[PDB]
PDB file of N, CA and C and ligand atoms in Angstrom:
ATOM      1  N   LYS A   1     173.197-139.341  57.501  1.00  0.00           N
ATOM      2  CA  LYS A   1     174.105-138.673  58.423  1.00  0.00           C
ATOM      3  C   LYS A   1     173.802-137.189  58.589  1.00  0.00           C
ATOM      4  N   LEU A   2     172.724-136.684  57.971  1.00  0.00           N
ATOM      5  CA  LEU A   2     172.417-135.259  57.987  1.00  0.00           C
ATOM      6  C   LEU A   2     171.929-134.755  59.327  1.00  0.00           C
ATOM      7  N   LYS A   3     172.465-133.638  59.808  1.00  0.00           N
ATOM      8  CA  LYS A   3     172.157-133.102  61.113  1.00  0.00           C
ATOM      9  C   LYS A   3     171.483-131.742  60.999  1.00  0.00           C
ATOM     10  N   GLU A   4     170.620-131.473  61.967  1.00  0.00           N
ATOM     11  CA  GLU A   4     170.066-130.129  62.066  1.00  0.00           C
ATOM     12  C   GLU A   4     171.195-129.155  62.264  1.00  0.00           C
ATOM     13  N   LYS A   5     171.069-127.906  62.129  1.00  0.00           N
ATOM     14  CA  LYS A   5     171.892-126.717  62.141  1.00  0.00           C
ATOM     15  C   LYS A   5     171.257-125.670  63.067  1.00  0.00           C
ATOM     16  N   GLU A   6     171.771-125.649  64.306  1.00  0.00           N
ATOM     17  CA  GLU A   6     171.347-124.610  65.242  1.00  0.00           C
ATOM     18  C   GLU A   6     172.080-123.321  64.911  1.00  0.00           C
ATOM     19  N   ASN A   7     171.456-122.219  65.247  1.00  0.00           N
ATOM     20  CA  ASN A   7     170.144-122.011  65.838  1.00  0.00           C
ATOM     21  C   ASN A   7     169.058-122.094  64.773  1.00  0.00           C
ATOM     22  N   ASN A   8     168.067-122.918  65.058  1.00  0.00           N
ATOM     23  CA  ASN A   8     166.952-123.137  64.171  1.00  0.00           C
ATOM     24  C   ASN A   8     165.622-122.969  64.899  1.00  0.00           C
ATOM     25  N   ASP A   9     165.577-121.991  65.796  1.00  0.00           N
ATOM     26  CA  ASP A   9     164.416-121.826  66.676  1.00  0.00           C
ATOM     27  C   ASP A   9     163.259-121.011  66.107  1.00  0.00           C
ATOM     28  N   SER A  10     163.378-120.509  64.901  1.00  0.00           N
ATOM     29  CA  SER A  10     162.342-119.744  64.218  1.00  0.00           C
ATOM     30  C   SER A  10     162.338-120.145  62.755  1.00  0.00           C
ATOM     31  N   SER A  11     161.256-119.915  62.017  1.00  0.00           N
ATOM     32  CA  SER A  11     161.167-120.485  60.659  1.00  0.00           C
ATOM     33  C   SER A  11     162.136-119.810  59.709  1.00  0.00           C
ATOM     34  N   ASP A  12     162.430-118.528  59.997  1.00  0.00           N
ATOM     35  CA  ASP A  12     163.435-117.799  59.231  1.00  0.00           C
ATOM     36  C   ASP A  12     164.815-118.441  59.382  1.00  0.00           C
ATOM     37  N   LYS A  13     165.080-119.245  60.412  1.00  0.00           N
ATOM     38  CA  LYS A  13     166.325-119.962  60.612  1.00  0.00           C
ATOM     39  C   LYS A  13     166.155-121.473  60.483  1.00  0.00           C
ATOM     40  N   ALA A  14     165.048-121.878  59.856  1.00  0.00           N
ATOM     41  CA  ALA A  14     164.779-123.316  59.706  1.00  0.00           C
ATOM     42  C   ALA A  14     165.881-124.060  58.965  1.00  0.00           C
ATOM     43  N   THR A  15     166.127-125.291  59.401  1.00  0.00           N
ATOM     44  CA  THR A  15     167.043-126.188  58.756  1.00  0.00           C
ATOM     45  C   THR A  15     166.346-126.812  57.548  1.00  0.00           C
ATOM     46  N   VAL A  16     166.954-126.677  56.392  1.00  0.00           N
ATOM     47  CA  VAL A  16     166.408-127.215  55.155  1.00  0.00           C
ATOM     48  C   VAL A  16     166.537-128.731  55.177  1.00  0.00           C
ATOM     49  N   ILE A  17     165.481-129.445  54.866  1.00  0.00           N
ATOM     50  CA  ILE A  17     165.553-130.870  54.622  1.00  0.00           C
ATOM     51  C   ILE A  17     165.636-130.993  53.107  1.00  0.00           C
ATOM     52  N   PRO A  18     166.775-131.309  52.558  1.00  0.00           N
ATOM     53  CA  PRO A  18     166.971-131.131  51.125  1.00  0.00           C
ATOM     54  C   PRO A  18     166.177-132.090  50.254  1.00  0.00           C
ATOM     55  N   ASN A  19     165.819-133.248  50.799  1.00  0.00           N
ATOM     56  CA  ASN A  19     165.188-134.284  50.024  1.00  0.00           C
ATOM     57  C   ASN A  19     164.192-135.047  50.910  1.00  0.00           C
ATOM     58  N   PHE A  20     163.193-135.635  50.268  1.00  0.00           N
ATOM     59  CA  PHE A  20     162.317-136.589  50.879  1.00  0.00           C
ATOM     60  C   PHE A  20     163.104-137.860  51.143  1.00  0.00           C
ATOM     61  N   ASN A  21     162.563-138.722  51.987  1.00  0.00           N
ATOM     62  CA  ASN A  21     163.160-140.034  52.302  1.00  0.00           C
ATOM     63  C   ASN A  21     164.607-139.869  52.742  1.00  0.00           C
ATOM     64  N   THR A  22     164.858-138.878  53.601  1.00  0.00           N
ATOM     65  CA  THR A  22     166.192-138.554  54.053  1.00  0.00           C
ATOM     66  C   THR A  22     166.159-138.317  55.544  1.00  0.00           C
ATOM     67  N   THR A  23     166.934-139.080  56.303  1.00  0.00           N
ATOM     68  CA  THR A  23     166.943-138.963  57.749  1.00  0.00           C
ATOM     69  C   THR A  23     167.728-137.758  58.226  1.00  0.00           C
ATOM     70  N   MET A  24     167.050-136.942  59.051  1.00  0.00           N
ATOM     71  CA  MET A  24     167.677-135.831  59.738  1.00  0.00           C
ATOM     72  C   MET A  24     167.866-136.221  61.206  1.00  0.00           C
ATOM     73  N   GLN A  25     169.039-135.996  61.760  1.00  0.00           N
ATOM     74  CA  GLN A  25     169.298-136.198  63.175  1.00  0.00           C
ATOM     75  C   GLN A  25     169.166-134.894  63.956  1.00  0.00           C
ATOM     76  N   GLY A  26     168.487-134.912  65.093  1.00  0.00           N
ATOM     77  CA  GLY A  26     168.439-133.725  65.913  1.00  0.00           C
ATOM     78  C   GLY A  26     168.305-134.101  67.388  1.00  0.00           C
ATOM     79  N   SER A  27     168.351-133.028  68.180  1.00  0.00           N
ATOM     80  CA  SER A  27     168.188-133.158  69.610  1.00  0.00           C
ATOM     81  C   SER A  27     167.448-131.953  70.180  1.00  0.00           C
ATOM     82  N   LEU A  28     166.728-132.171  71.269  1.00  0.00           N
ATOM     83  CA  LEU A  28     166.021-131.157  72.027  1.00  0.00           C
ATOM     84  C   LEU A  28     166.355-131.366  73.501  1.00  0.00           C
ATOM     85  N   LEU A  29     167.583-131.001  73.831  1.00  0.00           N
ATOM     86  CA  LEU A  29     168.162-131.150  75.161  1.00  0.00           C
ATOM     87  C   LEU A  29     168.082-129.841  75.935  1.00  0.00           C
ATOM     88  N   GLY A  30     167.596-129.914  77.182  1.00  0.00           N
ATOM     89  CA  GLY A  30     167.631-128.702  77.999  1.00  0.00           C
ATOM     90  C   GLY A  30     166.733-127.637  77.399  1.00  0.00           C
ATOM     91  N   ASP A  31     167.265-126.400  77.356  1.00  0.00           N
ATOM     92  CA  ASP A  31     166.471-125.269  76.911  1.00  0.00           C
ATOM     93  C   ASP A  31     166.400-125.163  75.386  1.00  0.00           C
ATOM     94  N   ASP A  32     166.928-126.129  74.652  1.00  0.00           N
ATOM     95  CA  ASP A  32     166.621-126.204  73.230  1.00  0.00           C
ATOM     96  C   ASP A  32     165.303-126.962  73.101  1.00  0.00           C
ATOM     97  N   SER A  33     164.209-126.200  72.920  1.00  0.00           N
ATOM     98  CA  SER A  33     162.893-126.834  72.935  1.00  0.00           C
ATOM     99  C   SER A  33     162.193-126.865  71.574  1.00  0.00           C
ATOM    100  N   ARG A  34     162.787-126.236  70.588  1.00  0.00           N
ATOM    101  CA  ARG A  34     162.227-126.085  69.257  1.00  0.00           C
ATOM    102  C   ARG A  34     163.294-126.241  68.187  1.00  0.00           C
ATOM    103  N   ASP A  35     163.006-127.039  67.166  1.00  0.00           N
ATOM    104  CA  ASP A  35     163.829-127.170  65.968  1.00  0.00           C
ATOM    105  C   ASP A  35     162.926-127.008  64.752  1.00  0.00           C
ATOM    106  N   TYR A  36     163.111-125.897  64.043  1.00  0.00           N
ATOM    107  CA  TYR A  36     162.371-125.658  62.812  1.00  0.00           C
ATOM    108  C   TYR A  36     163.088-126.236  61.607  1.00  0.00           C
ATOM    109  N   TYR A  37     162.309-126.878  60.748  1.00  0.00           N
ATOM    110  CA  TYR A  37     162.772-127.376  59.463  1.00  0.00           C
ATOM    111  C   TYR A  37     161.867-126.834  58.342  1.00  0.00           C
ATOM    112  N   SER A  38     162.374-126.918  57.120  1.00  0.00           N
ATOM    113  CA  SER A  38     161.572-126.591  55.957  1.00  0.00           C
ATOM    114  C   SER A  38     161.800-127.605  54.845  1.00  0.00           C
ATOM    115  N   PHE A  39     160.816-127.730  53.962  1.00  0.00           N
ATOM    116  CA  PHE A  39     160.992-128.576  52.789  1.00  0.00           C
ATOM    117  C   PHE A  39     160.101-128.076  51.668  1.00  0.00           C
ATOM    118  N   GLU A  40     160.399-128.532  50.460  1.00  0.00           N
ATOM    119  CA  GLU A  40     159.638-128.110  49.294  1.00  0.00           C
ATOM    120  C   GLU A  40     159.053-129.300  48.560  1.00  0.00           C
ATOM    121  N   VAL A  41     157.769-129.241  48.283  1.00  0.00           N
ATOM    122  CA  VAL A  41     157.062-130.208  47.477  1.00  0.00           C
ATOM    123  C   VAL A  41     157.040-129.729  46.047  1.00  0.00           C
ATOM    124  N   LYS A  42     157.464-130.570  45.103  1.00  0.00           N
ATOM    125  CA  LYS A  42     157.472-130.243  43.695  1.00  0.00           C
ATOM    126  C   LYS A  42     156.316-130.886  42.927  1.00  0.00           C
ATOM    127  N   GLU A  43     155.783-131.989  43.438  1.00  0.00           N
ATOM    128  CA  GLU A  43     154.676-132.697  42.797  1.00  0.00           C
ATOM    129  C   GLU A  43     153.658-133.059  43.886  1.00  0.00           C
ATOM    130  N   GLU A  44     152.381-132.758  43.680  1.00  0.00           N
ATOM    131  CA  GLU A  44     151.366-133.045  44.696  1.00  0.00           C
ATOM    132  C   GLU A  44     151.393-134.509  45.061  1.00  0.00           C
ATOM    133  N   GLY A  45     151.255-134.788  46.357  1.00  0.00           N
ATOM    134  CA  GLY A  45     151.129-136.145  46.804  1.00  0.00           C
ATOM    135  C   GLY A  45     151.106-136.289  48.302  1.00  0.00           C
ATOM    136  N   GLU A  46     150.975-137.558  48.710  1.00  0.00           N
ATOM    137  CA  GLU A  46     150.948-137.882  50.141  1.00  0.00           C
ATOM    138  C   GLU A  46     152.353-137.899  50.701  1.00  0.00           C
ATOM    139  N   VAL A  47     152.541-137.172  51.793  1.00  0.00           N
ATOM    140  CA  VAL A  47     153.806-137.090  52.511  1.00  0.00           C
ATOM    141  C   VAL A  47     153.598-137.741  53.860  1.00  0.00           C
ATOM    142  N   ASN A  48     154.517-138.583  54.295  1.00  0.00           N
ATOM    143  CA  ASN A  48     154.430-139.230  55.589  1.00  0.00           C
ATOM    144  C   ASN A  48     155.590-138.742  56.435  1.00  0.00           C
ATOM    145  N   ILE A  49     155.268-137.847  57.359  1.00  0.00           N
ATOM    146  CA  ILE A  49     156.247-137.266  58.268  1.00  0.00           C
ATOM    147  C   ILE A  49     156.382-138.188  59.465  1.00  0.00           C
ATOM    148  N   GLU A  50     157.604-138.617  59.737  1.00  0.00           N
ATOM    149  CA  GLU A  50     157.885-139.585  60.784  1.00  0.00           C
ATOM    150  C   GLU A  50     159.040-139.118  61.678  1.00  0.00           C
ATOM    151  N   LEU A  51     158.738-138.936  62.946  1.00  0.00           N
ATOM    152  CA  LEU A  51     159.738-138.621  63.947  1.00  0.00           C
ATOM    153  C   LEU A  51     159.912-139.878  64.784  1.00  0.00           C
ATOM    154  N   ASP A  52     161.144-140.273  64.956  1.00  0.00           N
ATOM    155  CA  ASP A  52     161.551-141.427  65.769  1.00  0.00           C
ATOM    156  C   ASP A  52     162.290-140.953  67.011  1.00  0.00           C
ATOM    157  N   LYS A  53     161.717-141.206  68.183  1.00  0.00           N
ATOM    158  CA  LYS A  53     162.357-140.793  69.394  1.00  0.00           C
ATOM    159  C   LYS A  53     163.519-141.723  69.756  1.00  0.00           C
ATOM    160  N   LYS A  54     164.698-141.195  70.057  1.00  0.00           N
ATOM    161  CA  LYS A  54     165.797-142.036  70.429  1.00  0.00           C
ATOM    162  C   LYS A  54     165.920-142.109  71.949  1.00  0.00           C
ATOM    163  N   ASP A  55     165.214-141.260  72.676  1.00  0.00           N
ATOM    164  CA  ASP A  55     165.109-141.252  74.127  1.00  0.00           C
ATOM    165  C   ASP A  55     163.627-141.053  74.474  1.00  0.00           C
ATOM    166  N   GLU A  56     163.214-141.507  75.646  1.00  0.00           N
ATOM    167  CA  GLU A  56     161.843-141.261  76.040  1.00  0.00           C
ATOM    168  C   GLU A  56     161.740-139.833  76.562  1.00  0.00           C
ATOM    169  N   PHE A  57     160.918-139.056  75.876  1.00  0.00           N
ATOM    170  CA  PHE A  57     160.571-137.685  76.252  1.00  0.00           C
ATOM    171  C   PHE A  57     159.336-137.264  75.481  1.00  0.00           C
ATOM    172  N   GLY A  58     158.778-136.113  75.772  1.00  0.00           N
ATOM    173  CA  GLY A  58     157.567-135.661  75.117  1.00  0.00           C
ATOM    174  C   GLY A  58     157.904-134.685  73.993  1.00  0.00           C
ATOM    175  N   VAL A  59     157.785-135.224  72.786  1.00  0.00           N
ATOM    176  CA  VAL A  59     158.093-134.442  71.610  1.00  0.00           C
ATOM    177  C   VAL A  59     157.020-134.672  70.567  1.00  0.00           C
ATOM    178  N   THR A  60     156.697-133.601  69.829  1.00  0.00           N
ATOM    179  CA  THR A  60     155.791-133.736  68.696  1.00  0.00           C
ATOM    180  C   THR A  60     156.146-132.715  67.634  1.00  0.00           C
ATOM    181  N   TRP A  61     155.275-132.467  66.673  1.00  0.00           N
ATOM    182  CA  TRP A  61     155.584-131.572  65.592  1.00  0.00           C
ATOM    183  C   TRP A  61     154.321-130.963  65.022  1.00  0.00           C
ATOM    184  N   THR A  62     154.508-129.841  64.356  1.00  0.00           N
ATOM    185  CA  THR A  62     153.446-129.047  63.764  1.00  0.00           C
ATOM    186  C   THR A  62     153.897-128.587  62.383  1.00  0.00           C
ATOM    187  N   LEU A  63     153.109-128.915  61.391  1.00  0.00           N
ATOM    188  CA  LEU A  63     153.365-128.565  60.011  1.00  0.00           C
ATOM    189  C   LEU A  63     152.457-127.411  59.581  1.00  0.00           C
ATOM    190  N   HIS A  64     152.998-126.457  58.812  1.00  0.00           N
ATOM    191  CA  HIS A  64     152.160-125.448  58.162  1.00  0.00           C
ATOM    192  C   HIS A  64     152.800-124.967  56.875  1.00  0.00           C
ATOM    193  N   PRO A  65     151.995-124.496  55.933  1.00  0.00           N
ATOM    194  CA  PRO A  65     152.561-123.997  54.671  1.00  0.00           C
ATOM    195  C   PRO A  65     153.220-122.654  54.882  1.00  0.00           C
ATOM    196  N   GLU A  66     154.107-122.260  53.972  1.00  0.00           N
ATOM    197  CA  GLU A  66     154.698-120.946  54.011  1.00  0.00           C
ATOM    198  C   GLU A  66     153.552-119.948  53.800  1.00  0.00           C
ATOM    199  N   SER A  67     152.497-120.379  53.098  1.00  0.00           N
ATOM    200  CA  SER A  67     151.210-119.700  53.007  1.00  0.00           C
ATOM    201  C   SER A  67     150.524-119.679  54.367  1.00  0.00           C
ATOM    202  N   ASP A  68     144.011-121.382  57.873  1.00  0.00           N
ATOM    203  CA  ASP A  68     144.731-121.971  59.009  1.00  0.00           C
ATOM    204  C   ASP A  68     144.999-123.466  58.829  1.00  0.00           C
ATOM    205  N   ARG A  69     145.635-123.705  57.700  1.00  0.00           N
ATOM    206  CA  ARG A  69     146.045-125.077  57.410  1.00  0.00           C
ATOM    207  C   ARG A  69     147.231-125.427  58.285  1.00  0.00           C
ATOM    208  N   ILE A  70     147.015-126.291  59.235  1.00  0.00           N
ATOM    209  CA  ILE A  70     148.034-126.745  60.172  1.00  0.00           C
ATOM    210  C   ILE A  70     147.814-128.212  60.446  1.00  0.00           C
ATOM    211  N   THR A  71     148.878-128.993  60.515  1.00  0.00           N
ATOM    212  CA  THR A  71     148.814-130.427  60.714  1.00  0.00           C
ATOM    213  C   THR A  71     149.707-130.812  61.890  1.00  0.00           C
ATOM    214  N   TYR A  72     149.185-131.671  62.784  1.00  0.00           N
ATOM    215  CA  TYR A  72     149.925-132.083  63.942  1.00  0.00           C
ATOM    216  C   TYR A  72     150.394-133.534  63.906  1.00  0.00           C
ATOM    217  N   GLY A  73     151.587-133.762  64.499  1.00  0.00           N
ATOM    218  CA  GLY A  73     152.025-135.131  64.562  1.00  0.00           C
ATOM    219  C   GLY A  73     151.167-135.914  65.561  1.00  0.00           C
ATOM    220  N   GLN A  74     151.018-137.210  65.331  1.00  0.00           N
ATOM    221  CA  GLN A  74     150.244-138.091  66.216  1.00  0.00           C
ATOM    222  C   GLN A  74     151.209-138.967  66.973  1.00  0.00           C
ATOM    223  N   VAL A  75     151.231-138.739  68.290  1.00  0.00           N
ATOM    224  CA  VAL A  75     152.147-139.485  69.163  1.00  0.00           C
ATOM    225  C   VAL A  75     151.659-140.914  69.396  1.00  0.00           C
ATOM    226  N   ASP A  76     152.535-141.886  69.134  1.00  0.00           N
ATOM    227  CA  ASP A  76     152.269-143.287  69.442  1.00  0.00           C
ATOM    228  C   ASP A  76     153.579-143.889  69.934  1.00  0.00           C
ATOM    229  N   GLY A  77     153.755-143.845  71.251  1.00  0.00           N
ATOM    230  CA  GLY A  77     155.011-144.322  71.804  1.00  0.00           C
ATOM    231  C   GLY A  77     156.233-143.558  71.352  1.00  0.00           C
ATOM    232  N   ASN A  78     157.202-144.293  70.764  1.00  0.00           N
ATOM    233  CA  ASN A  78     158.416-143.593  70.339  1.00  0.00           C
ATOM    234  C   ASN A  78     158.319-143.137  68.896  1.00  0.00           C
ATOM    235  N   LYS A  79     157.159-143.163  68.266  1.00  0.00           N
ATOM    236  CA  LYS A  79     156.954-142.577  66.946  1.00  0.00           C
ATOM    237  C   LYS A  79     155.954-141.436  66.989  1.00  0.00           C
ATOM    238  N   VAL A  80     156.194-140.390  66.176  1.00  0.00           N
ATOM    239  CA  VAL A  80     155.236-139.300  66.019  1.00  0.00           C
ATOM    240  C   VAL A  80     155.060-139.094  64.529  1.00  0.00           C
ATOM    241  N   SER A  81     153.868-139.379  64.043  1.00  0.00           N
ATOM    242  CA  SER A  81     153.684-139.610  62.630  1.00  0.00           C
ATOM    243  C   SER A  81     152.432-138.957  62.094  1.00  0.00           C
ATOM    244  N   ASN A  82     152.417-138.768  60.773  1.00  0.00           N
ATOM    245  CA  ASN A  82     151.129-138.420  60.120  1.00  0.00           C
ATOM    246  C   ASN A  82     151.338-138.565  58.621  1.00  0.00           C
ATOM    247  N   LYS A  83     150.289-138.643  57.855  1.00  0.00           N
ATOM    248  CA  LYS A  83     150.244-138.706  56.399  1.00  0.00           C
ATOM    249  C   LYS A  83     149.324-137.577  55.966  1.00  0.00           C
ATOM    250  N   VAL A  84     149.802-136.733  55.073  1.00  0.00           N
ATOM    251  CA  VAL A  84     149.052-135.559  54.614  1.00  0.00           C
ATOM    252  C   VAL A  84     149.310-135.353  53.137  1.00  0.00           C
ATOM    253  N   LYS A  85     148.243-135.039  52.411  1.00  0.00           N
ATOM    254  CA  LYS A  85     148.406-134.786  50.977  1.00  0.00           C
ATOM    255  C   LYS A  85     148.775-133.318  50.802  1.00  0.00           C
ATOM    256  N   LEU A  86     149.924-133.045  50.218  1.00  0.00           N
ATOM    257  CA  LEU A  86     150.414-131.695  50.047  1.00  0.00           C
ATOM    258  C   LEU A  86     150.545-131.295  48.566  1.00  0.00           C
ATOM    259  N   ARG A  87     150.181-130.065  48.239  1.00  0.00           N
ATOM    260  CA  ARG A  87     150.378-129.462  46.934  1.00  0.00           C
ATOM    261  C   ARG A  87     151.780-128.876  46.866  1.00  0.00           C
ATOM    262  N   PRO A  88     152.279-128.639  45.670  1.00  0.00           N
ATOM    263  CA  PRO A  88     153.614-128.034  45.534  1.00  0.00           C
ATOM    264  C   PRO A  88     153.666-126.714  46.288  1.00  0.00           C
ATOM    265  N   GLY A  89     154.802-126.515  46.910  1.00  0.00           N
ATOM    266  CA  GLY A  89     155.069-125.329  47.671  1.00  0.00           C
ATOM    267  C   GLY A  89     156.049-125.636  48.787  1.00  0.00           C
ATOM    268  N   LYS A  90     156.363-124.601  49.552  1.00  0.00           N
ATOM    269  CA  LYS A  90     157.288-124.698  50.681  1.00  0.00           C
ATOM    270  C   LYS A  90     156.470-124.838  51.960  1.00  0.00           C
ATOM    271  N   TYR A  91     157.005-125.689  52.822  1.00  0.00           N
ATOM    272  CA  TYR A  91     156.381-126.043  54.090  1.00  0.00           C
ATOM    273  C   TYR A  91     157.384-125.894  55.235  1.00  0.00           C
ATOM    274  N   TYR A  92     156.827-125.513  56.389  1.00  0.00           N
ATOM    275  CA  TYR A  92     157.577-125.380  57.624  1.00  0.00           C
ATOM    276  C   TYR A  92     157.128-126.442  58.609  1.00  0.00           C
ATOM    277  N   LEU A  93     158.103-127.083  59.213  1.00  0.00           N
ATOM    278  CA  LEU A  93     157.882-128.202  60.145  1.00  0.00           C
ATOM    279  C   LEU A  93     158.581-127.901  61.458  1.00  0.00           C
ATOM    280  N   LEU A  94     157.800-127.640  62.501  1.00  0.00           N
ATOM    281  CA  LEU A  94     158.298-127.280  63.793  1.00  0.00           C
ATOM    282  C   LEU A  94     158.289-128.564  64.655  1.00  0.00           C
ATOM    283  N   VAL A  95     159.470-128.999  65.042  1.00  0.00           N
ATOM    284  CA  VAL A  95     159.624-130.106  66.004  1.00  0.00           C
ATOM    285  C   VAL A  95     159.834-129.459  67.371  1.00  0.00           C
ATOM    286  N   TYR A  96     158.990-129.791  68.340  1.00  0.00           N
ATOM    287  CA  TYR A  96     159.088-129.094  69.632  1.00  0.00           C
ATOM    288  C   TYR A  96     158.772-130.100  70.724  1.00  0.00           C
ATOM    289  N   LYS A  97     159.311-129.774  71.915  1.00  0.00           N
ATOM    290  CA  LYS A  97     159.036-130.698  73.048  1.00  0.00           C
ATOM    291  C   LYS A  97     158.060-130.078  74.032  1.00  0.00           C
ATOM    292  N   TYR A  98     157.392-130.957  74.744  1.00  0.00           N
ATOM    293  CA  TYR A  98     156.482-130.621  75.808  1.00  0.00           C
ATOM    294  C   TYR A  98     156.845-131.241  77.147  1.00  0.00           C
ATOM    295  N   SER A  99     157.829-132.144  77.197  1.00  0.00           N
ATOM    296  CA  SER A  99     158.363-132.594  78.470  1.00  0.00           C
ATOM    297  C   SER A  99     159.723-133.220  78.216  1.00  0.00           C
ATOM    298  N   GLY A 100     160.556-133.161  79.235  1.00  0.00           N
ATOM    299  CA  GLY A 100     161.798-133.858  79.213  1.00  0.00           C
ATOM    300  C   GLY A 100     162.820-133.373  78.200  1.00  0.00           C
ATOM    301  N   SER A 101     163.740-134.239  77.794  1.00  0.00           N
ATOM    302  CA  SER A 101     164.792-133.948  76.866  1.00  0.00           C
ATOM    303  C   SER A 101     165.183-135.212  76.103  1.00  0.00           C
ATOM    304  N   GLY A 102     165.600-135.078  74.843  1.00  0.00           N
ATOM    305  CA  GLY A 102     166.079-136.244  74.128  1.00  0.00           C
ATOM    306  C   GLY A 102     166.512-135.949  72.709  1.00  0.00           C
ATOM    307  N   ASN A 103     166.984-136.995  72.064  1.00  0.00           N
ATOM    308  CA  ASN A 103     167.404-137.093  70.694  1.00  0.00           C
ATOM    309  C   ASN A 103     166.331-137.698  69.828  1.00  0.00           C
ATOM    310  N   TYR A 104     166.315-137.380  68.545  1.00  0.00           N
ATOM    311  CA  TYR A 104     165.336-137.892  67.614  1.00  0.00           C
ATOM    312  C   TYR A 104     165.938-137.995  66.208  1.00  0.00           C
ATOM    313  N   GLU A 105     165.222-138.726  65.332  1.00  0.00           N
ATOM    314  CA  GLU A 105     165.463-138.709  63.897  1.00  0.00           C
ATOM    315  C   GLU A 105     164.174-138.283  63.204  1.00  0.00           C
ATOM    316  N   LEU A 106     164.268-137.580  62.095  1.00  0.00           N
ATOM    317  CA  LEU A 106     163.106-137.081  61.387  1.00  0.00           C
ATOM    318  C   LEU A 106     163.220-137.432  59.914  1.00  0.00           C
ATOM    319  N   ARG A 107     162.127-137.907  59.320  1.00  0.00           N
ATOM    320  CA  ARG A 107     162.054-138.104  57.888  1.00  0.00           C
ATOM    321  C   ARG A 107     160.761-137.522  57.342  1.00  0.00           C
ATOM    322  N   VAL A 108     160.837-136.971  56.128  1.00  0.00           N
ATOM    323  CA  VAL A 108     159.646-136.601  55.390  1.00  0.00           C
ATOM    324  C   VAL A 108     159.603-137.602  54.238  1.00  0.00           C
ATOM    325  N   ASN A 109     158.795-138.646  54.423  1.00  0.00           N
ATOM    326  CA  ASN A 109     158.738-139.714  53.426  1.00  0.00           C
ATOM    327  C   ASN A 109     157.778-139.375  52.297  1.00  0.00           C
ATOM    328  N   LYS A 110     158.096-139.760  51.071  1.00  0.00           N
ATOM    329  CA  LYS A 110     157.238-139.526  49.916  1.00  0.00           C
ATOM    330  C   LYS A 110     157.428-140.581  48.844  1.00  0.00           C
TER     331      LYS A 110
HETATM  332 CA1  LIG B   1     168.093-129.043  68.237  1.00  0.00          CA
HETATM  333 CA1  LIG B   2     166.666-125.574  68.064  1.00  0.00          CA
HETATM  334 CL1  LIG B   3     158.360-134.109  44.953  1.00  0.00          CL
END
């Protein structure tokens, strides 16, 4: 039932994802085109970031460490996904749209 917290349009205002394997609900309607999130890895491992589109629109995501290591989501229909091996540290996850408007769910699986 966890929801994003606007305004979250910059990493300094990112919505904390408190835990792995936890669904975050958000929306990118109208001129809300960016939702920043953050999370912390405590033990090195593979993380599977999964965005589920609840409406058809053009949305993806970009991951980078708080530390040019950058990872992009891979769009496949109504899922935008990737698997990346991450070391302990804090990470920023920018969910942003490139067309249209809609609702989504986000998980950082581990
Ligand atoms: Ca939003
Ligand atoms: Ca936002
Ligand atoms: Cl962990």
